[PDB]
Amino acid sequence: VKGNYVQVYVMLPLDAVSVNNRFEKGDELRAQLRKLVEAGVDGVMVDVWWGLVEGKGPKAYDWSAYKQLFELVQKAGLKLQAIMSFHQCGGNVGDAVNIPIPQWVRDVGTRDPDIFYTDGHGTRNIEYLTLGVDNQPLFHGRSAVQMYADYMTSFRENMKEFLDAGVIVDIEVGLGPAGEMRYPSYPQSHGWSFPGIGEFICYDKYLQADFKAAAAAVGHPEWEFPNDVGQYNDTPERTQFFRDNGTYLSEKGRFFLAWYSNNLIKHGDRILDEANKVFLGYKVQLAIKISGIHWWYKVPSHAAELTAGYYNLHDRDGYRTIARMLKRHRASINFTCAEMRDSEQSSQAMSAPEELVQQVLSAGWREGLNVACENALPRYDPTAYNTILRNARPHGINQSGPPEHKLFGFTYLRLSNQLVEGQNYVNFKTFVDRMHANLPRDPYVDPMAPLPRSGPEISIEMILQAAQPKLQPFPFQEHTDLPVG
Numbered sequence: 001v002k003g004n005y006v007q008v009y010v011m012l013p014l015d016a017v018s019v020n021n022r023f024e025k026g027d028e029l030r031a032q033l034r035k036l037v038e039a040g041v042d043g044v045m046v047d048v049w050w051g052l053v054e055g056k057g058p059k060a061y062d063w064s065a066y067k068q069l070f071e072l073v074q075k076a077g078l079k080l081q082a083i084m085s086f087h088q089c090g091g092n093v094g095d096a097v098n099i100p101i102p103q104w105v106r107d108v109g110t111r112d113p114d115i116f117y118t119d120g121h122g123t124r125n126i127e128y129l130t131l132g133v134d135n136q137p138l139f140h141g142r143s144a145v146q147m148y149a150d151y152m153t154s155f156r157e158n159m160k161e162f163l164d165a166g167v168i169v170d171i172e173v174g175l176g177p178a179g180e181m182r183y184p185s186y187p188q189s190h191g192w193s194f195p196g197i198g199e200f201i202c203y204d205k206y207l208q209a210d211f212k213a214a215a216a217a218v219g220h221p222e223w224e225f226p227n228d229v230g231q232y233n234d235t236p237e238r239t240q241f242f243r244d245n246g247t248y249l250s251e252k253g254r255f256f257l258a259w260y261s262n263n264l265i266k267h268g269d270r271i272l273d274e275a276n277k278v279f280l281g282y283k284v285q286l287a288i289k290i291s292g293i294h295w296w297y298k299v300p301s302h303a304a305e306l307t308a309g310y311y312n313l314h315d316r317d318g319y320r321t322i323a324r325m326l327k328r329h330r331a332s333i334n335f336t337c338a339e340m341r342d343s344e345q346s347s348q349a350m351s352a353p354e355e356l357v358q359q360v361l362s363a364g365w366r367e368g369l370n371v372a373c374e375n376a377l378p379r380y381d382p383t384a385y386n387t388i389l390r391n392a393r394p395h396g397i398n399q400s401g402p403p404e405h406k407l408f409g410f411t412y413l414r415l416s417n418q419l420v421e422g423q424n425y426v427n428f429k430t431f432v433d434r435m436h437a438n439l440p441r442d443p444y445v446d447p448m449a450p451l452p453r454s455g456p457e458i459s460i461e462m463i464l465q466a467a468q469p470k471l472q473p474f475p476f477q478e479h480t481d482l483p484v485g
C-alpha cells in the first residue's frame with residue numbers, strides 16, 4: 001500500500017515575508033502550520049522573492065526574514081519547497097501584494113527598455129527580464145543568468161543548515177512571469193481577458209536580432225514576425241494566422257513558432273544548468289513550472305498555447321520537447337490544473353484542462369521525470385479534491401505495490417485562515433488522508449539522493465525529436481477509486 005502515498009504541500013501566503021522584507025506573521029503562521037501538521041501535510045511551498053532579497057543593490061542579499069520563516073517551518077516539522085522567484089508579484093489594480101523585481105534592475109530598464117519582454121505595440125512588461133538578455137552583461141556588469149546563479153548561490157550558502165537538516169527538499173526555478181516557463185502572453189495589465197488568444201511577446205530588440213540571425217541562417221533573411229495574428233482578446237477564427245488551415249501551417253509560420261518555443265526551451269536549459277551546478281551534492285530536486293493554458297486546446301491551432309511559447313498541435317507534442325530538455329538535469333515538472341474538469345469551463349473558451357493535464361503528465365512520465373501538480377484556482381470542495389485524486393493516481397490504488405504512474409507530489413494553492421477552519425479544514429484533512437492512501441504521514445517518504453551533475457548538453461535538434469510522433473496519453477480513470485466522501 002505505501003507505494004501509493006502522494007505527498008501534499010501547501011503554498012504559503014504571497015506575503016509570508018512582508019513587502020518590506022520583514023517577517024511579520026510569526027504568530028499567525030505558527031498556529032496555521034500546526035493545523036497543517038495536524039491535518040497530515042508533508043510540507044509547504046514559498047516564493048523566495050528576488051525583489052525583496054536583492055532589493056537594495058547588486059549582491060546585497062538580505063536573507064534575514066526568510067531565515068526566521070524557515071526556522072518556523074523547521075520547528076513545525078514540515079518540509080519546504082523554495083521557489084527562486086525572479087518575477088514580480090502582483091502589480092495590477094486591486095492586487096493585494098505587490099513585489100516588483102529589484103528597483104536597481106528596473107533602473108537599468110529606464111535606459112535600456114529592451115530588457116523587458118515587449119509586445120507588437122511596444123508595451124514593456126516589467127514583471128520579468130526577457131530571455132533575450134540571459135547572456136547580455138547589462139546589469140552593472142552581470143548578465144541575467146549570472147544574477148540568477150549568484151542569487152541561488154547566496155541562497156545555498158545562507159540556508160545551508162536547512163538544506164543539511166533535510167528541511168528544504170525542492171528548489172523550483174522561476175523561469176518567467178508567475179515563475180512559469182513561458183512568455184507573458186496573457187497580461188491583465190495590457191488588457192487581456194480570458195479567453196483571448198494572447199500575443200507573441202518577442203519584440204524586444206534582443207529577440208528581434210536573434211530572429212533575424214536565425215532566419216538568415218536558413219536562407220530567409222527577409223523574413224519577419226507574422227503580422228496576421230490579431231491581438232490579445234481575439235479568437236482564433238478572427239485571425240489569418242490562427243484560423244483553421246491558417247498561416248500557422250506555412251513554412252514561415254512553422255519556422256517562427258519553432259524559433260519562439262525553442263528560445264524558451266534554451267532559456268530553461270541554460271538556467272537549469274546553472275541551478276544544478278549550484279545545488280550539486282545537496283539532497284534536493286530541481287523543478288520548473290509549466291503554465292496550464294487550457295483555453296483553445298480544442299481548436300487545431302492551440303492558439304493560446306502557441307503565444308505562451310508551448311508549440312503544441314495535434315501532431316506535435318510541445319510538452320514532451322520540454323520534458324526531453326529536463327531529462328539531463330533530472331529536473332521535475334510542476335504543472336497546474338490538477339483540480340479542473342472540462343465540464344466546469346466556458347464553452348466559448350474551447351477549453352480542455354483534463355486532456356492537457358493528461359498530455360503533460362504522460363510527457364513527463366515517458367521521459368522518466370517526476371511530475372507534480374498544483375490547483376490553478378482556489379477550491380475547497382470535495383469535487384475538486386476528487387479531481388486532484390484522480391490525477392494523482394490515474395490508474396487508482398495498486399494493492400500489490402506502487403501504481404504504474406502517480407504524481408510525485410501535489411501543492412495546494414493556498415494557505416489562509418479560510419483553509420484551516422470549519423468544513424474547509426475537514427474536507428482538506430480528508431483529502432490529505434486520501435492522497436496518503438489512508439496511511440499516516442510519513443516524513444521519510446521519497447528520500448532525495450545527493451543531486452548529481454546534469455548530463456551532457458544536447459542540441460535543440462536532439463530535443464525536438466521528442467515532438468513527433470505525438471502519442472496518445474496514458475488512459476486515466478474517469479473517477480478516483482478513493483474519493484473523499
Ligand SMILES: OC[C@H]1O[C@H](O[C@H]2[C@H](F)[C@@H](O)[C@@H](O)O[C@@H]2CO)[C@H](O)[C@@H](O)[C@@H]1O
Pocket residue numbers: 011014047083085087088089090178179180289291292336374375376377
Ligand atoms: O506562490 C506561487 C506563485 O503563485 C501565483 O502563480 C500561480 C497561479 F496563481 C496559478 O493559477 C498557476 O498559474 O500557477 C502559478 C504558479 O504557482 C503567483 O502569481 C506567482 O507570482 C507565485 O510565484
Ligand SMILES: [Cl-]
Pocket residue numbers: none
Ligand atoms: Cl517514444
